[PDB]
Amino acid sequence: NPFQFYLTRVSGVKPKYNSGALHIKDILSPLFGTLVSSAQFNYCFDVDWLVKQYPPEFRKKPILLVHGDKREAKAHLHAQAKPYENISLCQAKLDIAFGTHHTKMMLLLYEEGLRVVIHTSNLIHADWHQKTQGIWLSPLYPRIADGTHKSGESPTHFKADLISYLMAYNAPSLKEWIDVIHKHDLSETNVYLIGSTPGRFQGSQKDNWGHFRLKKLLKDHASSMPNAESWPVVGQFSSVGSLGADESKWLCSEFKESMLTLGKESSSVPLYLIYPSVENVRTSLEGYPAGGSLPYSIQTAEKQNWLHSYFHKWSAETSGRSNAMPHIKTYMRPSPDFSKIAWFLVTSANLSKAAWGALEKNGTQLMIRSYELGVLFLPSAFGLDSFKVKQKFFAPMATFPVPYDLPPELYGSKDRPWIWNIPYVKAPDTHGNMWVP
Ligand SMILES: O=C(O)c1ncc(O)nc1C(=O)O
């Protein structure tokens, strides 16, 4: 397969549904490279657990943890890392309120080259245990010979775009990694980088980040097709922010308009949102505790009940993961019969203005609160017009492995979106428990 798109291993499914999945121990194995140093970009960290996932012979190699924690949270993280002399920390600046460092990325420097891993999991045991999570694995990037002058750039501009994402941190520990990336050849990269960094962007810079970055890529590198209005948009996520009093405020105005973009020319397009119902969570491998990682609050949800009529159940028979609650986030543009897709995005970004950006100042400025990161699969980048959808995720290699079932299934009348801070005591979960916050 050319896509190098993986799910994490799930404890409790039959072996055929973990054949070709990746645990973090697999990613860090000596089989992937002889580790020299690594950078772990993430949101939440269990440092004791994390070091144990490295092979014993690599556990004293330098590790950089890139996080966004402040005040007591920051002190807690520093206390976690203090027993390991080889661990340094980089506090990503979050100068806009309510933003987080949400990017999930590994930079893996080997003796043999460099690897980039962009994924969706926190660095804690539960995120790699029984959740549905996504991974993109870069090729092994070789080092450019000293004295050789070449770009090492890909047709997707991935090398420059990754350096640009890192330069936004303005951080000395990350300038070191930028110099490492400069010294490697990334030209085989066939995915486009889509990042979010905190800021207020106008003019040219508007297209650099968030949903405007997505729009620009789709404008420039996808083509429109007859009856494009009939190709739905699908968004699939594990948290929802405050989107406004009705769908015109953000979801169907600027967000959907970016996601609908195809080609360069100038809406009844169906919008399917996939987010676990209470029943999905109750019957899950984890039971109600899976809802600890689905942080939709009642205070947000009660102000936007209009949104829930967009919601579809989590279903993943194709990958044996209907009971492994989603922590992956994905966005895509399937054909009206869901047999093809025009593009697929895997990312850390949930369905929030903080992650994707919201227009300000009479539509001239895109404001983003958070760090986010994903990779975009475009048919043009593989010499194709569209991707066919792989029928069984783990079963002509140029079909894209969509990890959940199509078409998505609308909530039933008695279904409700998972809301983590109200009790569920009508029926017990797979471990025999109720949910009482
Ligand atoms: O996983 C979590 O618990 C989580 N919590 C809050 C947030 O904004 N995002 C996430 C995520 O990683 O999806």
Curated annotation (Swiss-Prot):
Region annotation Interaction with DNA: where it falls in the sequence: 239-242
Keywords attached to this entry: Cytoplasm, Disease variant, DNA damage, DNA repair, Exonuclease, Hydrolase, Neurodegeneration, Nuclease, Nucleus, Phosphoprotein, Repeat
Binding site for substrate: K104, K329
Superkingdom of source: Eukaryota
MF (Gene Ontology): 3'-tyrosyl-DNA phosphodiesterase activity; double-stranded DNA binding; exonuclease activity; single-stranded DNA binding
Phenotype upon changing Q133A: Slightly reduced hydrolysis of the covalent intermediate between the active site nucleophile and DNA
GO cellular component: cytoplasm; intracellular membrane-bounded organelle; nucleoplasm; nucleus; plasma membrane
GO BP field: DNA repair; double-strand break repair; single strand break repair
Keyword Cell cycle on entry: no
Effect of H327R: In SCAN1; reduces enzyme activity and leads to the accumulation of covalent complexes between TDP1 and DNA
Active site: H102 (nucleophile), H327 (proton donor/acceptor)
Consequence when changing N350A: Reduced hydrolysis of the covalent intermediate between the active site nucleophile and DNA
EC nos: 3.1.4.-
Localization: Nucleus; Cytoplasm
Free-text tissue specificity from the UniProt record: Ubiquitously expressed. Similar expression throughout the central nervous system (whole brain, amygdala, caudate nucleus, cerebellum, cerebral cortex, frontal lobe, hippocampus, medulla oblongata, occipital lobe, putamen, substantia nigra, temporal lobe, thalamus, nucleus accumbens and spinal cord) and increased expression in testis and thymus.
Illness: Spinocerebellar ataxia, autosomal recessive, with axonal neuropathy 1: A form of spinocerebellar ataxia, a clinically and genetically heterogeneous group of cerebellar disorders. Patients show progressive incoordination of gait and often poor coordination of hands, speech and eye movements, due to degeneration of the cerebellum with variable involvement of the brainstem and spinal cord.
Subunit structure, as described in the record: Monomer.
Family: Belongs to the tyrosyl-DNA phosphodiesterase family.
Protein function: DNA repair enzyme that can remove a variety of covalent adducts from DNA through hydrolysis of a 3'-phosphodiester bond, giving rise to DNA with a free 3' phosphate. Catalyzes the hydrolysis of dead-end complexes between DNA and the topoisomerase I active site tyrosine residue. Hydrolyzes 3'-phosphoglycolates on protruding 3' ends on DNA double-strand breaks due to DNA damage by radiation and free radicals. Acts on blunt-ended double-strand DNA breaks and on single-stranded DNA.
Name of the protein this chain belongs to: Tyrosyl-DNA phosphodiesterase 1
